[PDB]
Motif scaffolding. Sequence first.
Motif, short mmCIF file in Angstrom:
data_model
loop_
_atom_site.label_atom_id
_atom_site.label_comp_id
_atom_site.label_asym_id
_atom_site.label_seq_id
_atom_site.Cartn_x
_atom_site.Cartn_y
_atom_site.Cartn_z
N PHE A 165 0.82 -1.20 0.00
CA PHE A 165 0.00 0.00 0.00
C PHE A 165 0.86 1.26 0.00
O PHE A 165 0.57 2.21 -0.73
CB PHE A 165 -0.94 0.00 1.21
N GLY A 168 0.98 2.60 -4.06
CA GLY A 168 -0.26 3.30 -4.04
C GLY A 168 -0.25 4.54 -4.92
O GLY A 168 0.79 4.96 -5.44
N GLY A 199 -0.53 5.02 2.93
CA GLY A 199 -0.44 3.58 2.77
C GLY A 199 -0.74 2.80 4.03
O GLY A 199 -1.39 1.75 3.96
N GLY A 231 -4.45 2.76 4.40
CA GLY A 231 -5.03 1.77 3.51
C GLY A 231 -4.86 0.35 4.02
O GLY A 231 -5.79 -0.47 3.94
N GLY A 244 -7.35 -0.15 6.75
CA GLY A 244 -8.67 -0.39 6.19
C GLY A 244 -8.83 -1.81 5.68
O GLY A 244 -9.88 -2.44 5.86
#
Lengths: 40, 162, 153, 80, 141, 90, 742
Positions: B62, B66, B78, B81, B84
Motif C-alpha cells: 500500500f 499506491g 499507505g 489503507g 482499512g
Amino acid sequence: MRDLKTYLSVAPVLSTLWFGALAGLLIEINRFFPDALTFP
Amino acid sequence: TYQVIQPINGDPFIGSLETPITSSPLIAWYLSNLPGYRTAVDPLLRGIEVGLAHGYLLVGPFVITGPLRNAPNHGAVGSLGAAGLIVILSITLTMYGIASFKEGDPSTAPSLTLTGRKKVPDPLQTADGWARFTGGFFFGGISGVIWAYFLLYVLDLPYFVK
Amino acid sequence: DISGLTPCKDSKQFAKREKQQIKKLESSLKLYAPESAPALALNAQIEKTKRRFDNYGKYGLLCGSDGLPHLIVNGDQRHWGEFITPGILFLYIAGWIGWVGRSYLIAISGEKKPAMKEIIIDVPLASRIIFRGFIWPVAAYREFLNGDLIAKD
Amino acid sequence: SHSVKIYDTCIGCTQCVRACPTDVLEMIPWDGCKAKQIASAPRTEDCVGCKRCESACPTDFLSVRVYLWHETTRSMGLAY
Amino acid sequence: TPPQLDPSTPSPIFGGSTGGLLRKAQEEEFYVITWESPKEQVFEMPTGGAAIMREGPNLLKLARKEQCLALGTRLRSKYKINYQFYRVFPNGEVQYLHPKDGVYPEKVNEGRTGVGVNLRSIGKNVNPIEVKFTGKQVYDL
Amino acid sequence: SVYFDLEDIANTTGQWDVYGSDAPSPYNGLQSKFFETFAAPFTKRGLLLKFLLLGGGATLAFVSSQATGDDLPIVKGPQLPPQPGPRGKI
Amino acid sequence: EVKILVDKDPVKTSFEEWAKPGHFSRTIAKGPDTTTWIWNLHADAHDFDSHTSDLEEISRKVFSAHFGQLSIIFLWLSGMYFHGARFSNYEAWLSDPTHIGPSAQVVWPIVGQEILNGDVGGGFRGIQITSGFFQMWRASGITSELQLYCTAIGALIFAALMLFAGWFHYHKAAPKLAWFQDVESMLNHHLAGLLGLGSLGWAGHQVHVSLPINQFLNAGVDPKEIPLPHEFILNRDLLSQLYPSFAEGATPFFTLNWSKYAEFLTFRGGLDPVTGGLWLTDIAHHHLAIAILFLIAGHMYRTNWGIGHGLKDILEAHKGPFTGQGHKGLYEILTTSWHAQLSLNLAMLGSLTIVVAHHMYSMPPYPYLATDYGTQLSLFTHHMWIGGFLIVGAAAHAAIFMVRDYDPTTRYNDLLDRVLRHRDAIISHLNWACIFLGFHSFGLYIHNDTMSALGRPQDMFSDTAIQLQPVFAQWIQNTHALAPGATAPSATASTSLTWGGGDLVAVGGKVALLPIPLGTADFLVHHIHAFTIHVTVLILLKGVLFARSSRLIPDKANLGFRFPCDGPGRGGTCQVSAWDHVFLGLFWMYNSISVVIFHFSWKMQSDVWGSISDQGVVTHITGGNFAQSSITINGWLRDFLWAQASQVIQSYGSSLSAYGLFFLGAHFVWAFSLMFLFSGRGYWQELIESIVWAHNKLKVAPATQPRALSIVQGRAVGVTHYLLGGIATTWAFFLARIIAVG
Ligand code: CLA
Ligand code: CLA
Ligand code: CLA
Ligand code: CLA
Ligand code: CLA
Ligand code: CLA
C-alpha cells in the motif's frame, strides 16, 4: 464394368459432373454474352 | 525396492498421498508450530500472532505502489489503507464465524491424531473460539500496521526500499 | 423519367463514369511496350468497357444522379426486360427442375429399398424423366384439376 | 429426488433395468404383457437423472419416463 | 432373503490415489462393496488406476453408489464374480442395498411390489390446468 | 491390515488432525495476560460486526470529507480554461 | 531375426466394393434409413481400428494410406514447379529480385476477374505469391524455366510411383505385423538412411551446383551466361577458379587436412550483405556435419548382429524411488498401439514446426527472403498454424489411446498408472497456474487501459512509467552477442542479427534484420502467450487424464471416446467426453496462435522492417509505435486493427480486390458458425418436422428421412467454420496489408 458404372452413379460423382457441366455452360454463355443486365 | 510416495496414513482409499512436500519431518514440525495449528492454546493469542504478522506484511504494498506513493505523505496514506484492509478482513472473519458456528454446538475439529490417539478437538471451530480468534486478529493487525509505520517513518531506519 | 431518373444516354454522370474507367485502364498501359501481350489485354478490357456502356445506353436503362443504371420493377411495359421476362424464364427453369425431381421421387417410391436409388441414382430412369420438364406447366396444371398434385392426407 | 414412472405400454424386455447406473429400477411380475413382467422404480432416491433407461426404451412412445425434480446430494452425483 | 452382514474382510492391494474418499464420507455417508475372488488379479479402479484383488473375500470403500455399481458390473462382466454393496453412515449404521432381494433386479422375482407404475399410456396424462393451484403433478395421478 | 471398523468410523473415513499440535502454550504468561486484558472488548462477535461496519463507514465518510486538493485531483478541481464545443456550443 | 515378411495377394482388386458404400463397417453397409447415415459414412472412413480388430490388417491400411498421401504431395509439388515454369516471371525476377514481385498464377479473362492480374513488374501481370518458391529456386541454382519443367515431370513420375506402390503393398505384397514391429530397424534406417543420406546428397548438390551458380549470381553476372551445373562437374577447372582448393581433389579429405576446404566450408554467421540471407558456405558445412551426425546416430540399435541397443532394455533400466518400475512396459504399448505413436509424433512435429517458424525469420536461409516481407509474414503464420493444429491432434489421439487401447491387465506401465493416481493434483495446480497467469498478464492491460482513460499515464506499466524489464531475455541476448569472441571463437559473427551485435543488414534500400529490442511491452505479450499456452494445455490434459473415468462418471470409458453427454443428470453432463475437450481446446489454440501472429506482425512492422536511405537513416513501416501503444487493449484496437486494416478495406478496384472479398467472406463464415455453436438439434428436428409435412402434402417427401445433425456433429461444424472464418480473416488482412505497404 457394371460395378464401375454403379459407382459413377453415386451422388457425389454425379453431382460434380452435373455442376461442372453447368459451370462450363454458364461460363461460355458469359464469355460470348458478357455484361447482361437486362433481357433484350 | 524403496518407494518414497505412500498412501496417506497407510490407507490407500483416502483421497490423498504422502509426499515429501506434505509429510517430511521439517515441514510437519513447521506446520505444527504455526499459530493456526496450536490446538491446546487460547485462540485469542493465536489470532493476535496471525494479525501481527499479516498487518505488518500488508504495509509495504500500500505504501509503495499506491496512488500517492510519490507524495511526501505516502507512508501515512499507505498505512491507513493497510488498516482499512485489516478492518475489512476482520469483518469477513466475523461474518464467517457467525454463519458457520452456533453458540451451543461443540467443535467440528477432528478428535483423532494420525496415530489414532484421542485428543481434545480444537476450540477454534466453535462460536466463542472463533470470536476470540477474530478479535485477536483485529487487535494484532492494527498493532502490526502501527508498528510497521513506526519503524519506517517515525524512526526512519535506513531501509533500502522505503 | 420514372421516379426522377434520367435515361443513361442523356445523363452526363454515366459518360463521366465511362471516361474515368477508360482513363484508369489507360494508366497501366503506360508501363508496357505498345506491342506487348499485357498491352493487348488491357486494350481488350477497354473495348469491353466501351461495349458495355454503349449497350447500357442502347437498351434504354434509367440512371440516377450517380451515373449508375437503376432497375424498374413495378410493371412498366417499357422495362419488362429487367424483371418480368427474366423472372418468367427463371420460373420456367425452376419449375422444370422441381417437376423432374418430383417425378423421379414418385417413380422410385414403390420399391423394396427406395433409399438406395436416392444415393445411387438410376441414371437411365433420370434420363427418361429429365425431358418431361419441357412441358412441365401443362402437366402441373393437369394434375391440379384431376387431383394428383396434392395429397389429401 | 427425481421422479421415475412406468406406463403399461411396457413389453418387459428388461432393457431399462440393466441400463441403470445406480440400481433404481427392477422387474416385477405382471400379466398385462406376453413377458409377464413390468418395470418398477422403488429406489428413486438414488436416481441421478441421466435418462439412460429412456435411451433403451423400445416402445413408442416411452414406457419409462424420468422427470427432473428437487435436487439432493445423491441426485447431483457429488462425491465431496 | 435375509441380507448378509458386514465382516472385517481384507481390501485389495492398492498404492493410494487422490480419487478416494473425502470429508463427505466423514459427515454424510460412504459405500462398501464386497465380493469374492478365486485368484489374485488386476482390476481397474473406478477412481483411477489399477489394483490387485486378492483371492478370497474382498472389501472396498467408495464415495458413491454409482462407483460401486460400475465396479460390480465390471466384475460380473469380466471376471464372473458376484458382488454386494452397502451404505455406511457416520454413526456406524449399515444399510444393505444391492442385490436387494438376493436376486439381481434385471431378473423377475416374486415378492416385489410395483412402485411408480401408471396404469395408463403416457399420452393419457391430464393437462397442467387440471392440477393448477394443487400440489400434485400430472404424472403422480 | 484392515482399514474398515464399524466401531471407529472416524479412523475409517480419515477424520484425523494431521498438523494439529497438543503442546502447551508457547507464549509468555505476562504477555498473554496483557493481550487478554486489552483484547477482551473485541471478542463479542455481535458487537464486533456492528462496530466494524458502522465505525468503518463513518471513518470512510469523514476521511473523504477531510481530503484536500493535494490528495485528490477531484477535490482540487479544474485549473484550465474550458474547451469549446464542436460547433460553438459551450 | 529381422527379415522381409510379406503376404501374397491378400485383397483382390475389384470394383465391387466401390458400388457398395459403407462396406468397411458392419452397421453402415446395410444402406441408409435416414440422412444421418450419409454423415456416418464420412466420419468413419479412416477409423481403421473400428473396422477390424486385427492389428496387421489395420497396419497394412495405414501403410497404403501413407503412399496415397505421398502421391498427393508429389502431385502438388509437380503443379507448383509446372506453374513456375509456365505461368511465372521467375526469369525476370532473377535479374532484378529487389524491384520485381514474384508471381506464378495468371487468371483467365472472364466475368471481369482479369483485374487480379496486377503489375508485379518485369512486364508481367499476375497474382503475387508469398510461398517463397522463387528464393528457394534461386538458392538451389535454378536459372531457367526448362529445369522447372523437368522437375515437374519428375514429380509426376514419382507421384505415379507412390500410387503404384500403395496399390502393390495393399493388394499384392502386404507386409506382416512382425515387419511393422521391427522398430529398431525402422529407427536405424530413418536416422542413417533417410535423414543422413538425404542431407549428404543435398550437401553434395550445394557444393557442386548451388555454391558456384550463386557465386556467379552474387557477383552480378547475367543468369543467361552462367555456366550450366553439369559444366561445373565436367571440367573441374571452372570449379578451381572460384575455389582453388578444388584443384586438390579429395586428397585433403582423406589425409585429414580439412582446413584446406575453408574456402567453401565456413563458420561465419550473420548474413550475406549482397543477399540478406545465410552464407551458402555455412549451409553446406551445416548439412555435411548433420549428415555425419545422423549416420553415426543410425547405428545405435541392435537389429541382427550383436552390436547395438535394445529399446526395451534401455526402457526397463530407467526407474527410481519415486517412479516404481519406471518405463518398463512402454515398449509393449508403443509397439501395439498406432494411436499412441500418432499422438507422440503429432506432438513432436507440431512442436518442431513452431521452432522452424521461429528460426526461419531470425536466420533467413534463402536469398532475398528477408527483404520480401510478405513471404516472411506468410511463412511464419502458416507454420505457426500447422504446428498448433498438429499439437491439438496429439492430445486428441492420446485421448483415443486412453479410451480404446489402455489395458492395465495386459499392458501395465507404472508411470502411466502413477500419473492416473494423482490427476487431481495435476489438474488443480494447472488451474491455479492458469488463473494466476491470466490475472498477472491480462489484468495489467486492463490496469494500463484504465490509467490511460483516467488521465494518469504515470501510473501505468510502461517504459516511461513503472517498468517491467525482461532482464533474463536481455541477458541471453547479450550473451549470444558476445559469443564470437569468448564462447564461439571460431565463429566470426553471432548466429543472428537480432541478438544485439549493433549491426543492420540492408538490401535494396530495405532493412533485412537488426537488433530487436525487448522492453515492458514484450514482457507483457510473452506472459500473455504463456497464459494461453497453459490454458490450452489444461483443457487438453484434463480431457486425456479424465477420459476413462471421473468422480461424476465412474464408467466414462464404456461411453466411448466421442459421445455427446450422459444425460441431464447429476446437474448436467454436457461435453464430458475426451472429444469435447479437443473441441474446446481448438478455440484456445486458435486464440493463442492469433495473439502470437499479431505480436509478430506488429513488432516486425514497428521495430525491424522499414526503409533506409543513402544517408544512414532508418524509417520503419509504423515508426516504432509498438513500445508505447501495444500496452493497452485500446492500442491494439486503434493502432493495429483499425490502422492496418485500412489496406484490405480500400482494395476494391485494384489487384488486391480478392482480399477484401475474402475478408468479408471470412467474417460471414465466422458469424455463420455461431448458429451451430449456440443452438441444439432438438429445435432443428422440430422445425424439420414442419417442412417434411409441406413436402408430404405435395408428394415430394424423400425416402431418406431428413434428420437434424447429431449433437457431436453440430459442434464439429461450428468449430470448423469458426476456425476457417477466423484464420481466413487474418490471411486476407495480413496479405493485403503486407503487399500494399511492404
Ligand atoms: C425434388 C426436389 C424438391 C422439391 C420439389 C422441393 C419442393 C419444396 N421445398 Mg424443398 N428441399 C429439397 C428438394 C426439393 N424441395 C432439398 C434437396 C432440400 C435440402 C437442401 C430442401 C429443403 C427445403 C427447405 C428447408 C424448405 C423447402 C421448402 C420447399 C417448398 C417450397 C419451395 C421452396 O422453398 O424451395 C426451396 C428449395 C430448396 C432450398 C432446396 C432445393 C434443392 C435443389 C434445387 C433440389 C434438387 C433435387 C434433386 C437433387 C434433383 C432430382 C434429380 C433426379 C431427376 C435424379 C416446396 C414444396 C420450404 C417449405 O417447406 O415451405 C413450404 C422450406 O422451408 N425445401
Ligand atoms: C495442387 C496442384 C495444382 C493446382 C492447385 C492447379 C491449379 C490450376 N492450374 Mg494446374 N497443373 C498441375 C497442378 C495444379 N494446378 C499439374 C501437376 C500440371 C501438370 C500436368 C498442371 C498443368 C496446368 C496447365 C497446363 C494449366 C493449369 C492451369 C491451372 C489453373 C486453372 C485450372 C482450371 O481451370 O482447371 C481446368 C478445369 C478442369 C480441369 C475441370 C475440372 C475437372 C473435374 C473433375 C470436374 C469435371 C466436370 C467437367 C468440367 C464438366 C464436363 C464433363 C463432360 C463429361 C461434359 C489453376 C490455378 C491453367 C492456367 O493457369 O491457365 C492460365 C493451365 O492452362 N495447370
Ligand atoms: C487400381 C484400382 C483399384 C481398385 C479397383 C481398388 C479396389 C479396392 N480397394 Mg484399393 N487401392 C488402390 C487401387 C485400387 N483399389 C490404390 C492405388 C491404393 C493405394 C492408395 C489402394 C489402397 C487401398 C486400401 C488401403 C484399402 C483399399 C480397399 C479396397 C477395396 C474397397 C475400396 C473402396 O470402396 O474404394 C472406394 C473408395 C474411394 C474411391 C476413395 C478414393 C479416394 C482417393 C484415393 C483419395 C483422393 C482424395 C483427394 C484428397 C480429393 C481431394 C478433393 C476433395 C476436397 C473434393 C476394393 C477391393 C480397402 C479394403 O480392402 O476394404 C476393406 C482398403 O482398406 N485399397
Ligand atoms: C534407408 C531406407 C529407408 C528409407 C529412405 C525410408 C524412407 C521412408 N519411409 Mg521407411 N522403412 C525402412 C527403410 C527406409 N524408409 C525399413 C527398413 C522399414 C521397416 C522397419 C521401414 C518402414 C516404414 C513404414 C512402416 C513407413 C515408412 C515410411 C517412410 C517414408 C516417410 C515419409 C517421408 O519422410 O517422406 C520422405 C519422402 C521421400 C524421401 C521421397 C522419396 C521416396 C523414397 C526414396 C522411397 C523409398 C524406397 C525404399 C527405401 C525402398 C524401395 C523398395 C524397392 C523394392 C523399390 C519415407 C519415404 C512411412 C510412409 O510414408 O510410408 C509410405 C511409413 O508409414 N517406412
Ligand atoms: C497425420 C495426422 C492425423 C491422422 C492420421 C489422423 C487420423 C484420424 N483421426 Mg485425427 N486429428 C489430427 C490429425 C490426424 N488424424 C489433428 C491434427 C487433429 C486436431 C484438429 C485431429 C483431431 C481428431 C478428432 C477430434 C478425431 C480424429 C479422428 C481420427 C480418426 C478418424 C478420421 C476420419 O475418419 O476422418 C474422416 C475425415 C473427414 C470427416 C473429413 C473432415 C473434413 C475437415 C473437417 C475439413 C477441413 C477443412 C479444409 C482444410 C478446408 C476446405 C475448405 C472447403 C470449402 C473445401 C483417424 C484415425 C476421430 C476418431 O474417432 O478417431 C478414432 C475423431 O473423433 N482426429
Ligand atoms: C473475453 C472473454 C473471455 C474471458 C475473459 C474468459 C476468461 C476465462 N476463461 Mg474462457 N472462454 C471464452 C471467453 C472468455 N473466457 C470463450 C468464448 C470460450 C469458448 C471456447 C471459453 C472457454 C474456456 C475454457 C474451456 C476454459 C476457459 C478458462 C478461463 C479462465 C482462465 C483463467 C483466467 O485467466 O482467470 C483470470 C481471470 C480473467 C482474465 C478475467 C478478467 C479479470 C480481470 C483481471 C478483471 C477483474 C477485476 C475485478 C475482479 C473486478 C471486480 C469488480 C467487482 C465490482 C465485481 C478465465 C475465467 C479456463 C479455466 O477455467 O481455467 C481456470 C478453461 O478451462 N475458458
